[PDB]
Amino acid sequence: HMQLTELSIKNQNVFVQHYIDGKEEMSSFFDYSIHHKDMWRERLEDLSSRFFAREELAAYLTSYHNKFGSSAMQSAIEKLKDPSSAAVVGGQQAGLLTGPLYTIHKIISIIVLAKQQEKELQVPVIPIFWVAGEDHDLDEINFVHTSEENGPVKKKLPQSYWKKSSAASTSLDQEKCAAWIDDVFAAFEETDHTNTLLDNVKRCLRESVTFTDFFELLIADLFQEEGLVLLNSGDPGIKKLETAMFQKILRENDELARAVSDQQAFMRQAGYKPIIESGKEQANLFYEYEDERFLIEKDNGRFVIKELDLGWTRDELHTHMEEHPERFSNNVVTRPLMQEFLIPTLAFIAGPGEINYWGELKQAFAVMGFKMPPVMPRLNITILERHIEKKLAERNISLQDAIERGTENQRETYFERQIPEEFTAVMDQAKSQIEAIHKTVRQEALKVDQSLEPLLLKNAAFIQDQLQFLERTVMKRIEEKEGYVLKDYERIQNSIKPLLAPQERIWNIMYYLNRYGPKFFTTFKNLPFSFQNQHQVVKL
Amino acid sequence: HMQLTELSIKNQNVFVQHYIDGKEEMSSFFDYSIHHKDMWRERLEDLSSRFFAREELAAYLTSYHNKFGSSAMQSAIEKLKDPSSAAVVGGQQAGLLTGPLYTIHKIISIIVLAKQQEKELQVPVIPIFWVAGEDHDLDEINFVHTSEENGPVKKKLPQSYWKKSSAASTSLDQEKCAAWIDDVFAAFEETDHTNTLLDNVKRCLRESVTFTDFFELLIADLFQEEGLVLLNSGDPGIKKLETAMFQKILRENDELARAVSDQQAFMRQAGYKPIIESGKEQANLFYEYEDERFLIEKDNGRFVIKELDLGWTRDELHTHMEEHPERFSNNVVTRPLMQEFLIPTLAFIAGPGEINYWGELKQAFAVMGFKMPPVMPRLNITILERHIEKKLAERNISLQDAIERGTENQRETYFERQIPEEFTAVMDQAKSQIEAIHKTVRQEALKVDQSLEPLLLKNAAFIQDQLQFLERTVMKRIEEKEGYVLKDYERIQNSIKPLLAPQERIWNIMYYLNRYGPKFFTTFKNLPFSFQNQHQVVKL
Numbered sequence A, B: 001h002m003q004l005t006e007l008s009i010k011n012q013n014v015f016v017q018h019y020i021d022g023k024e025e026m027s028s029f030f031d032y033s034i035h036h037k038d039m040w041r042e043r044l045e046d047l048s049s050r051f052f053a054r055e056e057l058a059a060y061l062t063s064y065h066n067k068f069g070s071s072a073m074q075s076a077i078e079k080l081k082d083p084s085s086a087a088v089v090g091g092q093q094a095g096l097l098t099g100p101l102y103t104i105h106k107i108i109s110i111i112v113l114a115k116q117q118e119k120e121l122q123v124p125v126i127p128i129f130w131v132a133g134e135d136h137d138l139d140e141i142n143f144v145h146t147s148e149e150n151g152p153v154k155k156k157l158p159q160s161y162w163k164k165s166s167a168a169s170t171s172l173d174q175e176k177c178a179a180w181i182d183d184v185f186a187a188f189e190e191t192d193h194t195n196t197l198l199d200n201v202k203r204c205l206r207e208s209v210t211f212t213d214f215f216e217l218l219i220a221d222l223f224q225e226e227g228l229v230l231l232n233s234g235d236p237g238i239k240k241l242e243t244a245m246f247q248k249i250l251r252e253n254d255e256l257a258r259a260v261s262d263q264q265a266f267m268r269q270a271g272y273k274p275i276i277e278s279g280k281e282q283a284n285l286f287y288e289y290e291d292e293r294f295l296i297e298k299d300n301g302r303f304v305i306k307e308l309d310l311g312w313t314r315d316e317l318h319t320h321m322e323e324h325p326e327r328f329s330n331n332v333v334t335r336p337l338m339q340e341f342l343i344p345t346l347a348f349i350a351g352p353g354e355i356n357y358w359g360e361l362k363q364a365f366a367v368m369g370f371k372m373p374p375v376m377p378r379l380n381i382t383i384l385e386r387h388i389e390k391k392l393a394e395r396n397i398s399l400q401d402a403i404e405r406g407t408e409n410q411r412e413t414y415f416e417r418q419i420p421e422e423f424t425a426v427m428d429q430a431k432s433q434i435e436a437i438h439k440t441v442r443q444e445a446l447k448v449d450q451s452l453e454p455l456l457l458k459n460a461a462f463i464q465d466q467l468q469f470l471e472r473t474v475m476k477r478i479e480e481k482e483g484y485v486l487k488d489y490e491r492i493q494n495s496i497k498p499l500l501a502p503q504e505r506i507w508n509i510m511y512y513l514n515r516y517g518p519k520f521f522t523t524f525k526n527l528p529f530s531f532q533n534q535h536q537v538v539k540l
């Protein structure tokens, strides 16, 4: 049976660790403390004073979700009409094949938190996944890692984009994407699960047009049972509902840019590293023209797009937003403000990057007139396959050590212990003694002609090169002799900390579905995860 | 002034040395002793019982020599009609430009001996040079040595021969031979003598048709004053006079071949090395057909030419000799017998090869019914140029040592004395100590994997190669540093014992005429040489 364990592992980002630890200084960066049990009721009471267009949102969502044919999704959306309901929201880009595992872990986080709070608070709490379909960074979503001879390599979908178009409006080349899927799967070991899985994934592709369509369909197959609601930020249909918040962003635009710059300075001053790159020429909105996305920038009280020589006064842009809301979209700064406008948010589920940059946005929320919602760290998970757990034990490596720093230093220690002790010492001594002997010869030779010196020093270096080559040869032979053990260090790392990054950032769910099957995933989803800020280890 | 000195130098051929020393056993190999003063009168008395066709020979020679326009040659030939006269004879091949210096030394020997005996005996004694014009070995005569960067090199006349024709009947390509002469002279330093000499040599060429014509003309220019008589064995004109001796060779042919084979065995048995290659199938005559020369061989009492499918009975060949004597010619074995038939010979002047092979012919002479004439060693000469004598002194080499063995061993000793003593010892020690150190490393490496051994032994040998290359480099630098001295050892050898052979075998008179002029040659000819069997050194 599958087992859940925990480990206490520090985040390498000191801001995120301080947040997780509940430092007093975090009230300068966040509006709700996740460290007191009664915060959730307080959050609900704060939400009861806000106005949402719940019927309109629910009708849009209902209409959007008719493509999935899921009574569970529809029953979730129906709960949004109850004025006491709220949602747990988190989001990701629309990675091909669902992208990195942290996308799955995030969705699990949303669903688990929403269920736990529905039970504790006794109001409906809906799990919403925010598909970042407005985003035009297709290089972030157009590949998965595959495992090759030297380790993980990006396998990119072979399709180029002329237009800088959003994920939600970029079409997939059906034939190229099907071939790519075959190429990803061809790297796996074939199992009893392979054909059915590959058929299901290809079915989802042929029912898609865009990157977001395909992502949604896979996610619905995986989670519709749990009643997960999908909100695609790049769907033209949602834009009408966003009009007044685009207009609010416009009206408070100068105050917003000030709020970002001041918070970022404060963060830098407190000892931390802001990551949002958005100066005071930025309106923090994008405009779509001819299927492409352009930055809106500021020029002495006006709004401009420099690449298209377009501009607007504030009043002209306000009217333009009313008439054509579908042309507008948010950036990193404004997306969270739009989320909070649209959705009655009990909690936002955040990864470590998002925790850092949400701390940059505290004053931004205030400029828009509402609190930052509570920010709950998503679950951080490592899947420990049984053959990897066996190898950790065989190589005398502690699980926590592997998760924190991989296996490279351990491997290097093992290899060195295979070099006989007396080799190193005699090799060191030989280099030095041979050079001393050679020097005595050069001393005699030089009495013939001082102009020999360069040639004599070349000769000495050539001999030392031979000795180095000898040493390199003996090391290569040890590498060969010990190759089966040494490869096990590499296998452990490849699984747990590929490229010295966390498993959940590098790998993807398809490997695991292919190897372990649907019953694995069902069990995995339903494990008793908890939000105590501990690293979760799922032992297969 | 030019000075004559002597040195006592042993011949490397023990037979020739024993002859020169007057060993008792030499009466098995020769008919007259050159070691008793009264032999010359005895020889004259033996000749007074022989019949020669002196008027016929003198008329032929007179007619032949009209091309030279020399009253001195003609006055010499006139002496042959005196029934008391005799000749000193010696011979050589018709080398281009007069061939090796020993050709000049031989002619000097003939002229000096003839003059000395004319004075002592008070009968006319004529100097005759036997031009070996019948010989078809053009590769022996179609070049001279020239001095190039690595020492003496043969410079061959660029002309090929289809026909295996005699020197006396082979035409020179006028244009190719003039070019070749220019190329030989171009290697000399130009002097005040050059143009006149080159003009004289080219004049002789344009007055020649054949190899023998050119040789004779040069020799006449050099010696006609002394009344040297030229007998060209390959002139058709002389053949009629030879008829009866061709016929005698025929009649006694079986006895001749037996005489050669028995003497050769005896010589081998006495401890010496016969050099004539002529078995019992050999008639020891050649036949000329269509300008080419063919061996006459024997086949069960008949005479055959195998290559032309021609044969004769003895009686048929006898008649053929009478009708066509011009078609016949002698080989190494029969030439001396023909010489003795034709010319009343007081003495034969011989080089060291000829002394050896004349010893093979003692019984051959007897089969023909006459004694072998006295064999006088020709003068062996070294010309010592003043700059070479200076260099011998500077390099601490004794003249005799240089003449006996060149300068190579001395040069090698000088060079070694320039290698510091402590270099050799430290280089030797280093090779050994480095290999001992490297071995200790290989001993440690091999504990990893025994299959490394070849690679480890390769590594060790590569290092030892570096040390050898170091040593070779230091030696090359010493060679450069000492290059002016070392080159002087080489210069001395190049002059005195080029290619470790005697000067007189390798070099040629033109270099000396070009450098030193006609006055040099006049003086050289007239030096007081003596026949005491000592090496003659002519100091310029």
Ligand SMILES: Nc1ncnc2c1ncn2[C@@H]1O[C@H](COP(=O)(O)OP(=O)(O)O)[C@@H](O)[C@H]1O
Residues within 6 Å of the ligand: A145, A146, A147, A148, A385, A388, A490, A491, A492, A494, A495, A507, A508, A511
């Ligand atoms: N695509 C993948 N996603 C996640 N983990 C992987 C993937 N491929 C391999 N692994 C893990 O990494 C380990 C080492 O993989 P690898 O070196 O490719 O091959 P193997 O272990 O089969 O020789 C695997 O045993 C597995 O646990």
Ligand SMILES: Nc1ncnc2c1ncn2[C@@H]1O[C@H](COP(=O)(O)OP(=O)(O)O)[C@@H](O)[C@H]1O
Residues within 6 Å of the ligand: B145, B146, B147, B148, B385, B388, B490, B491, B492, B494, B495, B507, B508, B511
């Ligand atoms: N063609 C030659 N015949 C005879 N002796 C020669 C000839 N050429 C050179 N020599 C002799 O050999 C010596 C060495 O000659 P070589 O090395 O050619 O040139 P050099 O001495 O002029 O540098 C000369 O100095 C001379 O005494």
